[PDB]
Amino acid sequence: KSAAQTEIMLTCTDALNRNYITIPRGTRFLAYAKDTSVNPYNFVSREDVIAIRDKNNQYFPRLKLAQGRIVRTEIIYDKLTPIIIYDKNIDRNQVKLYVDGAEWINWTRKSMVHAGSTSTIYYMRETIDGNTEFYFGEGEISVNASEGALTANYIGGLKPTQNSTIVIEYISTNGADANGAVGFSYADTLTNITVININENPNDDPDFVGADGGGDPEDIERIRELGTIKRETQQRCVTATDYDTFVSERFGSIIQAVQTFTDSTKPGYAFIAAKPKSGLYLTTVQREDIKNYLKDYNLAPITPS
Amino acid sequence: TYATLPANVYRIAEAITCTDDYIYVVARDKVRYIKTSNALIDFDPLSPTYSERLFEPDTMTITGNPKAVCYKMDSICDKVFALIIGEVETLNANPRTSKIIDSADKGIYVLNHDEKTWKRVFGNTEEERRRIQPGYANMSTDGKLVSLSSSNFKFLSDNVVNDPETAAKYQLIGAVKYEFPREWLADKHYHMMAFIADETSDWETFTPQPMKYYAEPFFNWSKKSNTRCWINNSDRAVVVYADLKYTKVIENIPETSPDRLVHEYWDDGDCTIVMPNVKFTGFKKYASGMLFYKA
Amino acid sequence: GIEASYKFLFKVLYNEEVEIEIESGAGTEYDIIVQSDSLTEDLVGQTIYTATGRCNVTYIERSYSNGKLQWTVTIHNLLGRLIAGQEVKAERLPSFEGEIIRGVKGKDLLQNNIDYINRSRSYYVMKIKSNLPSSRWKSDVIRFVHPVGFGFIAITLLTMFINVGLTLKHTETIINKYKNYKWDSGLPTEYADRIAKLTPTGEIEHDSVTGEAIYEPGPMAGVKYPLPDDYNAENNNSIFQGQLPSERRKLMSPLFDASGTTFAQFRDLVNKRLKDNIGNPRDPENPTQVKIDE
Amino acid sequence: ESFQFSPSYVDVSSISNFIIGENEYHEIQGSIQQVCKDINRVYLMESEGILYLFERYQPVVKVSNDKGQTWKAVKLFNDRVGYPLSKTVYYQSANTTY
Amino acid sequence: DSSVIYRAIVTSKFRTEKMLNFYNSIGSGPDKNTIFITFGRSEPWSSNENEVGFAPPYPTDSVLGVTDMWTHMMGTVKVLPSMLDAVIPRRDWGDTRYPDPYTFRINDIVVCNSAPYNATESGAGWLVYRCLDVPDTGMCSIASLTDKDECLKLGGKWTPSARSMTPPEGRGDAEGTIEPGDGYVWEYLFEIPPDVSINRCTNEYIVVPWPEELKEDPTRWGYEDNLTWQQDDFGLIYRVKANTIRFKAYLDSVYFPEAALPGNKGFRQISIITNPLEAKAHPNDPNVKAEKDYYDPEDLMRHSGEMIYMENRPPIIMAMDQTEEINILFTF
Amino acid sequence: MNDSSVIYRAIVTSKFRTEKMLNFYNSIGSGPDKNTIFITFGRSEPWSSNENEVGFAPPYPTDSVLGVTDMWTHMMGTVKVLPSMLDAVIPRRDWGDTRYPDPYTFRINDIVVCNSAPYNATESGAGWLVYRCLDVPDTGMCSIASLTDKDECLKLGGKWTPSARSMTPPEGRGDAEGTIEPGDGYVWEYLFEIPPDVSINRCTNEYIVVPWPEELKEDPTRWGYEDNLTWQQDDFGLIYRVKANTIRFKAYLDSVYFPEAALPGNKGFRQISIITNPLEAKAHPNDPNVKAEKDYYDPEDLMRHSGEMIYMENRPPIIMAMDQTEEINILFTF
């Protein structure tokens, strides 16, 4: 179940003139949705903002946003009982599990190998009953006595040490039924803030309604995806037409008309030919930047050109 | 300005202050109000009075200690400080450059104005006062910093307390564990600290903060060009050029005169505005967005 | 098949050990500018070598300076440190003769010779170059990893990880105070011990414990005697205080009236000695001090 | 690279938070030189006018626009200058260096 | 127990000096030790060698364990001071292959600028930063407490619960603060030239310069500019608290007279001996201390010098490729 | 890493522990390269309310600069440790003393001294001869640590308490090559000489001194060699064969060198460090700099925090009254 995102820039002032205002992550924005309901919907922010103070004292936080509540449910880790939160309104996109006293990156889909041993990456899966499991990797940082080296000993993410604290946070949402928007009513009691107005359409976009994600996906649409997994080579380019697939998928907003051709008698290169959608030759810090993001995948010998 | 002194501070000079409205000079803990522009002057034949504007008549002479040998003094916005070391050498008059000793009343001294009297907010106690040493101390100030300077950190009183737990697992009957009061102290050699305090307060009780450049307090502040200079003990001279944004400010000329490329036309309405093709090179951050025109 | 999959493989299956492999692969790139005619493109992908070093060419982009022709070639996976003034001939299309200026130093491999840098040329073979007997993984690198078109040779490296630096525990530090003797000296306050038994530091030891002779207390305690009613030659103030008191507050001073003091050196005060608790067999029995770590 | 722009941004100050900048820095380009015989007594002031150095007494000062690569000696102090008790000599505000 | 008690701990700086003492101890003249690496042990032990696990004979330090060794020694190499180097644990900023990519303890040296995902300056250099502070949020270290400062008193190690956006960008101490944005106050310390990093630095450790190579130029190391209240503070090997040293040599450098044996049958045990005497025909000769470059172990006197380290390992057969590497990283 | 397919075995032996120590002392010397050592003295502050007593103890120092900085604040004076004062030691077991628990015995490899005392004195023109160690225990009667027993179980197991006394444990200088075995079993292996002058000076109730190489190689026959054919085997030197593996240095604190501080009431509260390679005041800061070679520098003139602090300790009172010298012994295994 995917919550409803949006982006709003806000105008706030406060008694203190402090050179940089800051808005904490968790906040409370009350929002009406037309059609389906009457009673409000609770929007909570995401990440945080800084902005500045300029001319007549004003602040312009651009902060992003999402619907639903926020919950912690700390408990404690052990090597046997899996975490397994319960409420099915979780939004598996927005989560920060940190729990270690430090934040770990959500690895849910990066594949694996790109993260070596002891990497802080943690995983998650589905369950047979419909819940979510936060299970971590398997590996330890243990070091010998007479050695002294670090020596990451296993594969996957670093397994949290026993009895170590855990606290996680996810966005529990009321569902896609809140798709829409009305005037956002600021509540979000803070230290010193006065919210003047809110313009829910920054960037001066075209015809606009408060955006969202969908609800739970359908059933039959699930089956056609695994058929599109096996046939899809993920986190690699093994073919001459695979480079043209990844280069054009991401960078197609700038690059256009790519082809890659492998030349015998010069094994180990696989030149690719890319053209800008704007100019003629590829600029530096572009040609360089196209050469990256293919180093994360690549393969083998045979490195790009 | 020119000439010198109320004639009490003649020769025997100590530091400087510009402020904005008018200059400050100090000797033997004295002062002068010399106006930066449009001070009083007359040629009435007393003193050379060459139309070199004479100073304001009076003087403040902070606290009760003559020859108190105030150290370097500096200013930002409208306010000053004038750190004094101590001493006076314990004997009145005499040069202030020899045999400095430790005396009471040492402090930064403020000088919030309109009372012509200086408040002295930093050292109120031997704890804070001892932190200043006759050697190796400076008040130098980058814009909105006023770093002070120090060394000679020592655990004092509450820095050691309690330790019940060490009495456990042992018989010791008593123990003393440090509280590690946090004061940013430099690495390298001659570990240095800083009392830097800024805004948020009205200055007023400096508190320890990280020193950016390692003896930022020893630099000679400058306002025009807003750079700070100093000399490395290796005999090299170091420069800190401060900072800038990349704003070009394209084509700045008043409406008068030719050579202005950007200008606005009109034909039966229908605005047409023309620009040179702004371009620039060298910016070393990989960041992009508008060229972002603004006035 | 992609690099860093090996590093994931050897973790999972063949031993636990780390791996490092280098072919003419992906890697960091360096900038080198070379001047020649005949440098017409498609050299990208070839192997450039000089007398000193060997390398490959990623990107052929031209530079601009008057005279000759100067290209800035993007070079990667360099080994052998090509240097200015070298004649830089390409392996094939031979026809490349040129000169390098503004080179770079990629890699060492001890003595630098175009002959030695090749030895037997690896060409496109790949060096798995991780630990291991090489017969355990060799079956498993093929099948689950590696492309079918590359050479794949195995070589070994060894890492000792000597752990020295344990101990260095400083053991016990021990200091003991002295009452010592200088020609200043002055009035004692009474006396204690100072001799027992015969003349020559009487009855040397008991011979049971050997060492130094026993000491009997002798005259025990009382007033320090008035001193010769002045005791101060100049009535001076000696070291922060007058001579008549202090200036010799020491309870132990040579009188000339006993053989207790001997000569030179110092007398050690054994009543108070800071005693290392844990140590060699000898040890001072019940210890005076103890070292208890945090 | 951050900062999705919008309209409704009114004053530059408001979005001034996102602008490319130099973060400042410090260099050396030192080694100075002595004026008169006193290497300790010299002073240093850098400004728009670049690298003024002062003697304790003698009015002759040396100036370099090359950032210490080469020094040139000149007059223009034409007085005993000063012997302040710490370091600073040049102290300036709103131009008007003195 | 009632007695005077004193609580004392040797400082970590003691180690780095001890490390600096082992270096400089390599030289030609007397009072300068000379270290050799020895391999030997051609004959295989048991038949379970070449299998998995099974362990070797555990080596002993007695006189019997030394005597046989000298009988089996296949070849040796002399360690020159140039091929020895200081090393420290490297944490690449924002690398996902090592724990806590975006978070950092109070003081942890972290290299940045190498590989694209960290950019900062260009012109390479592999910049390094100590990190003097952290954002304050998240529970840390002993018991519970709450706030950073109180967790910094009473010992404690505070882990920031907020990822640190962007690498340290500047050339001088305390590059944080000075702006409403977050981040914390990294402190530049030196630089690593690109040329040395491709050779001298592996991915586990980054070299830190001996207080010698910093002379005959500082600039190459990016140390050319520094606060330096002292005329020099020249050696920074103390600043990093460098606790360890690392050795590297190519097996083409070690000398095997036979030249077909080490390849066919591996050297099963490696040991490093100090101060061997040259071959003496009879005990008619004065004692000389070993010099020049190779020493076929025939020319070494038996038990000639003392041996600090023995290793016993399965066969480790070696190919003749001009690159394979010794390591032997000391932790001093 | 853990549980790897290959498993290797590495001793690190003993000698590395000693040889590493030798390199420490092998440059203490005079010059720019030789990094001399300086000890240092303590704090004047009462350090607490409960200060003088047996229970309780100073707070545990901290290696951080926040603790490095307070010493140079609270420190007075630094005595210097010459190269000659530091010395390498051994626990000094001796046969015949009744004071120490076990009179003779001395199982397997142990160091003995005799001719040092009333009880053990023999053949004395040479003073202490005795650093010789026991090559083999005597025949049987060893009941060792476990169940098994016989002359076997030293190999699979621990050490032998021979249960039989030794007699005539004095010995000659030694047998040619290998050494003497006077009595029943208890073969003795003669280890150097130790003349009397160095004894009464640089030994103590605990431990004992061994010469460094560069002395013995320089001068046999004072420390008494040329009896040893195994000498020419591995050059002179022998700090290794003794397995010294420990170093202590000491310092004389004389209140004369610090007449200030030493007044009626100085309480010398804790803090007593060590340090390395300090520097002079420099006069005015710009100047060249010099290595500090002069004894008992005052705290001022040292360039606060010059050199690096190599050791720390806290001893809560001490005393440090005038005319009473102070002798500090500190013992490291490096």
From Swiss-Prot, chain A:
Please give the superkingdom of this protein's source.
Answer: Viruses
Q: Where does it live in the cell?
A: Virion
What inducers act on this gene? Expressed in the late phase of the viral replicative cycle.
Q: What does this protein do?
A: Baseplate protein that is located next to the tail tube (inner baseplate). Involved in the tail assembly. The gp25-(gp6)2-gp7 module is involved in sheath contraction.
Instruction: Tell me the protein family, please.
Output: Belongs to the T4likevirus baseplate wedge protein gp6 family.
Assembly, per entry: Homodimer; each gp6 molecule in the ring interacts with its two neighbors, forming an N-terminal dimer with one and a C-terminal dimer with the other. Heterotrimer with gp7; gp6 is part of a (gp6)2-gp7 heterotrimeric molecule. The (gp6)2-gp7 heterotrimeric molecule further interacts with gp25 and gp53; the gp25-(gp6)2-gp7 module is involved in sheath contraction.
What protein name is recorded for this chain?
A: Baseplate wedge protein gp6
Q: Which organism is it from?
A: Enterobacteria phage T4 (Bacteriophage T4)
Curated annotation (Swiss-Prot), chain C:
As for subcellular location, the record says: Virion
Q: Where is the signal peptide?
A: none
Look up the domain of life of the source.
Viruses
Q: Where is this region: Disordered?
A: 274-294
Quaternary structure annotation from Swiss-Prot or TrEMBL: Heterotrimer with gp6; assembles as a (gp6)2-gp7 heterotrimeric molecule. The (gp6)2-gp7 heterotrimeric molecule further interacts with gp25 and gp53. The gp25-(gp6)2-gp7 module is involved in sheath contraction. Interacts with gp8. Binds to gp10 homotrimer; disulfide-linked. Heteromultimer with gp10; a gp10 molecule is disulfide-linked to gp7 and the other two remaining gp10 molecules form a disulfide bond.
Q: What does this protein do?
A: Intermediate/inner baseplate protein. The gp25-(gp6)2-gp7 module is involved in sheath contraction. Involved in the tail assembly.
Q: Which family does the record claim for this protein?
A: Belongs to the T4likevirus baseplate wedge protein gp7 family.
Q: What is this protein called?
A: Baseplate wedge protein gp7
The beginning of the lineage is:
Viruses, Duplodnaviria, Heunggongvirae, Uroviricota, Caudoviricetes
The record's gene field reads: 7
Full protein stretch here: 739 to 1032 of 1032
UniProtKB/Swiss-Prot annotation, chain F:
The name this protein goes by in its record = Baseplate wedge protein gp8
Family in the record: Belongs to the tevenvirinae baseplate structural protein gp8 family.
Question: Where is it mainly found?
Answer: virion
Could you tell me which species this protein originates from?
Enterobacteria phage T4
Q: Which Gene3D superfamilies match?
A: baseplate structural protein gp8, domain 1, baseplate structural protein gp8, domain 2
| Recorded GO CC terms | virus tail, baseplate
Q: What does this protein do?
A: Intermediate baseplate protein. Involved in the tail assembly.
One Pfam family in the UniProt entry: Phage-Gp8
Description of how the protein assembles with itself and partners: Homodimer. Interacts with gp7. Part of the baseplate macromolecular complex which consists of gp5, gp5.4, gp27 (central spike complex); gp6, gp25, gp53 (inner baseplate); gp7, gp8 (intermediate baseplate); gp9, gp10, gp11, gp12 (peripheral); gp48 and gp54 (proximal region of the tail tube).
- List where in the cell it is found: Virion
Task: Report whether Disulfide bond shows up as a keyword of the record.
Answer: yes
Can the keyword Ligase be found in this entry's annotation? no
User: Which keywords has UniProt assigned to this entry?
Assistant: Disulfide bond, Viral baseplate protein, Viral release from host cell, Viral tail assembly, Viral tail protein, Virion
InterPro entries to which the protein is assigned, alphabetical: Gp8_sf, Phage_T4_Gp8
Single Gene Ontology BP annotation: viral tail assembly
- SUPFAM superfamilies per UniProt: Baseplate structural protein gp8
What are the disulfide bonds? C142-C153
Q: What induces it?
A: Expressed in the late phase of the viral replicative cycle.
